[model samples]
Target chain A: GMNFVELAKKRYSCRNYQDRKVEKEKLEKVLDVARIAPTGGNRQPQRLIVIQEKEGINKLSKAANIYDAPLAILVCGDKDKVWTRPFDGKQLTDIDTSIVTDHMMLQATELGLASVWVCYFNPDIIREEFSLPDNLEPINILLMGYESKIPESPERHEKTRVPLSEIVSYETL
Target chain B: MNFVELAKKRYSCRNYQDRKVEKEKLEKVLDVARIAPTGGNRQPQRLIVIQEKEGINKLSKAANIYDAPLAILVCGDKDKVWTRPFDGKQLTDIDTSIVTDHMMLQATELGLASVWVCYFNPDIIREEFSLPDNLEPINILLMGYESKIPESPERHEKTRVPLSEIVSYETL
Candidate 1:
């Protein structure tokens, strides 16, 4: 088992992918991880839209950074099923979906696969292409496959973040 | 080194010790948050790490979670975030939450305790914290050494729905 920090660090957006098919077992494991991810009120509003065929992948890649990967999983959430705050009616669909997406990305990393969280895709075109229901909103797309190259890490300063003094206050902000 | 166990063992930590978190550990954990996947690679987010006495006290009054030596305010930029054209669903909250989740898991792996908090009044937070116009506060995370580990609440058992019910084969 890899260290949690190492796993998190090693997982990066892979823009280059090999022209190879991912095994069914590996893909299923990633899906299972998403299945167990945390969701508000346990509503489980998210669903996976698997795209493996060249036609579908090409169609999706047209609007987003799919990198011609052999597989793409569109993470969707049912709006009606999401938990919302009573005071403001703040919906949790995207937050829940993001948790699910992160878990799947980590699972892919554990399996030695590469992934990129593609969120800039054309949801309207995707829904039309896949004949998806209106209630299901596509949140983010996971582009996955064997990696052809791993990008270099960022500079030490770029990798660092804002100072703790600036961000953290003791008791009152 | 417990692959998925690090994730599975992570429970929402409400109670925490008064002991301060080490600077190095906190930095590494924040790095984990920075590396978390963001929509469109926009990285349209900022985090506030709070540890001052008055700041923590004020935050405790605002949210229901137990007090901790450290708290992280996860905020997103409204103007820079990606939105779904079809429905105008803003992706900032989701993107920021992913970063928060990554930080939570890292806290667990580092032998620290943490919980995700979203019940605070954003308006009050913006005013109190002097946040900018474009930054929207999404979630707060309470973190510290474990002072007490509450028994896994019965609510937790109910929190997990069956995988078969949640997962679909290919089409939905």
Candidate 2:
């Protein structure tokens, strides 16, 4: 059994995926776990679209290159439902949606699945393509399925990421 | 045991004990943020760990963190984060949130309780913390031992909406 940090390290973005379809129950559990992720003010404003069928996948291809994956979750943030910062008039649509997407992605990885977090899509095209309402802002697209190759080493992060001392400071910035 | 059940065990702790967290546990929690996935692996998340009365006092002036013994101010460097091509959407907030989520869950695995705070005054935080121009405070994770009996996991069944309500199959 892996510990939390080990599990976190074990996950990596899988750009290429096997042709096999993800089990519905597995996908179901991932979405179910995503429900509990903390959102701004507990607004729970994330709206997800599970795209598995070929038609749905192809339709999504118009806005972003999803690479090869059996399924994807379109994570949207409801502007009307998000918690706004009164002091700054800052709405939490992006932060809330990202938190929910990360939770779902981690949950999927725990089930021995591979995943990717994609944000390079045209929101206008996505809104037009999905017929999304004005309030629902497309924040993230989480793609998941079996990997075509072995995952990158958990140790890769040590090489890829900035050193701890560089990013963290004690008591002050 | 897989961390999913442990993830389910995580609750938003609004209350905190005055008891201070150990330094070792604090290191463990912050270290997890180092490995969290950032947009395009930009690694733009910078964190400031606060525990001293003075630091907490300065932070409390900006937002209510419930006086937790430990708090991590998750900030993002807009200069370092990646942006999307189509919409030119900057990912400073999204990337920082991912980093904060990783740290919050790590704190939970270590048997600590936390609240994800976003309702802070950014100008006040930027001034109080003396943050550089590029760094913007995004979210704060207030962590400590729960002062009361932890919220029941059973309550989670009602705490969130049903999957049918949040999820749509094939299309939205």
Candidate 3:
């Protein structure tokens, strides 16, 4: 039973790839796996732009800290998809992108590869490179490749503390 | 499209055959959600995948949307972000929801069935799960092989909001 801890121990924000490109079969397996991100009423809005070209990958690396992986996948949400009322513009997009990033990171961990969940970047640079719609914002960029090394796990303060009794109290009898 | 096909065939499956979800299949599902988009790249999301039947039963008791064999509590990292033009804290509801949906769809693709259990007692879930204050309990995903219908929940027939209605073309 691999919970987040088992998986998290395996997952790492990796840098310094082996100059090897991820096979299309593996890429497809990764996508076919992640396309199931939960959406409002199943409104799967995340759009993917794979940076398969070397020039494109290099250009994308400039926009964010990708650690020079041979491949990157841009997870974006179409501004138009919504459920029950207008989309909360910013939030709907943010949640959609982050979840997609989570899926890929964990998958990479399982597939014996590694990834860095990047956020620091220039949006304008990404938009310009993708020739994306003004509304089709680039939310997350996943750096995928064989790992040369794994970054030390970030410190999780108070790694463990509360017991079940402290954390749980039933109200409905 | 696999997306449309999976979406259409998806249902809030509530029954299971006592089968445990494969480790590989579970990783694949989580992998799908990580690639989903979000705002500001703040990426304020986390998950607690409860694999133990005891843990699953505890979750079912805490936030019982269905009686599946297993469950995962989709959570949000709760840090205050003040809303612009209005003096108020940022909401995590929408963000939590999107990730939950991502899990649901991915569960569908893997031939597993799930139902979103949003009406659970969050306080109970937080207590039983022993989660951190930063991790906000949002939704419970009940998953297992379908012993019930695989057809999607019915959409509105006449009062449905059409794609043409919500979308507007500025050019052409």
Candidate number of the best TM-score:
2
Residues A78-157, model 3: lDDT tens digits: 66673332211233565555555665666666666667655566777877766778667666677788977555453331
TM-score, candidate 3, is 0.55
Off by over 4 Å in 2: none
Question: Between prediction 1 and prediction 3, which has the larger TM-score?
Answer: 1
Candidate 3 lDDT tens digits, B1-172: 3333444566556567678788788776665345443344345556677766667677767654455766777777666311323223333554565456666767776788887765566677777877778877766677888775565434423323443332221110
Tens digit of per-residue lDDT, candidate 2, span B1-172: 5656777788989898888989889888888889888888899998999999889998899998887899999999989999776768899999999889889988988889999888888898999999999998999899999999988766767888887878888778
Q: lDDT per prediction?
A: 0.76, 0.88, 0.59
As a whole number from 0 to 100, the lDDT of residue A99 in candidate 3 is: 54
For residue B80, what is the lDDT in candidate 1?
74
What DockQ results do all the predictions give, each relative to the true complex?
0.43, 0.82, 0.10
Please tell me how candidate 1 rates in CAPRI terms.
acceptable
Which one is best on DockQ?
2
Which residue pairs in candidate 2 collide? none
Candidate ranking (lDDT, best to worst): 2, 1, 3
TM-score, first chain, each model: 0.89, 0.97, 0.79
Q: Is the docking of candidate 2 incorrect, acceptable, medium or high quality?
A: high
